């Protein structure tokens, strides 16, 4: 069943329809849960990095700094969809940027700086020189 | 006036734009002076390397695709002897593809290199 969905494109769609809306927040809140529902799906990955969901989800993030919900979400999420592509060659100013702005600004949320450390812990399991940045 | 009053506009001979969306890493000139003036260009639209030619006279534009991972960098090799040009590719993976310059069916990998290859250069010191 899940093979089947897959093949129906569902992630072409939901990523579409979160990216190309970039008003209206609860349809970015529904596409985050659903991307976060997605990712743990035997053969998400590879089809999510194809069709460049990070951007969407990095741009997400940048145009909503206030939101809990969607931070939240969106600091779970970009650990989970990760590749060595995003940070090739050393280069992820972006990703650090949001990470910690986003840490700083929702210092006492406990779930929020526990989603986003792990999501650091993961990123630099890959490369080392993400510390520097 | 203000828009003629530009060495920009003086000495800006050409401009060509490549098609829709397209997102190229690397170039390097075919420049033997007497060959054949055009471009070698290494697609990263996506993520599957493409090797693209782009005649200058003509501005005609033909793409490839033959490396697993994007094209990282390019170099051109011309070997004096036998009248050899070869063109080397770098990819994201970490091959290292060798096709030549005139023929297009002489495809030959080398070593596969511990990972990403981030430049080709090529130069003399005598020896190439």
Redesign the interface.
């Given at each position: 069943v899940k093979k089947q969905c897959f093949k129906n494109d569902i992630h072409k769609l939901v990523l579409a329809a979160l990216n190309r809306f970039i008003g209206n927040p609860g349809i970015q809140k529904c596409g985050l849960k659903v991307i976060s529902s997605i990712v743990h799906f035997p053969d998400a990955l590879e089809m999510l990095?194809?069709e460049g969901a990070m951007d969407s989800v990095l741009h997400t993030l940048q145009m909503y700094p206030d939101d809990q919900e969607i931070q939240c979400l969106g600091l779970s999420l970009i650990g989970y969809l990760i590749t060595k592509?995003n940070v090739?060659?050393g280069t992820g100013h972006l990703l650090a940027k949001i990470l910690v702005s986003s840490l700083y600004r929702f210092k006492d949320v406990a779930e929020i700086q526990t989603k986003g450390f792990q999501t650091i812990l993961a990123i630099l399991k890959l490369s080392a020189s993400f510390s520097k940045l | 006036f203000d828009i003629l009053n530009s060495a920009e506009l003086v000495c800006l001979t050409r401009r060509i734009l490549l098609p829709k969306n397209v997102i190229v890493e690397c170039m390097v000139a075919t420049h033997h002076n007497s060959r054949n003036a055009s471009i070698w260009l290494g697609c990263g639209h996506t993520?599957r390397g493409q090797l693209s030619f782009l005649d200058l006279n003509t501005e005609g534009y033909t793409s490839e695709e033959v490396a697993d991972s994007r094209i990282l960098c390019l170099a051109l090799v011309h070997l004096p002897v036998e009248k050899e040009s070869w063109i080397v590719s770098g990819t994201?993976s970490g091959t290292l593809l060798v096709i030549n310059t005139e023929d297009g069916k002489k495809r030959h990998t080398l070593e596969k290199m511990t990972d990403?290859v981030?430049c080709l250069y090529c130069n003399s010191f005598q020896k190439n």
């Open positions: 990095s194809l592509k090739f060659i | 993520d994201q990403s981030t």
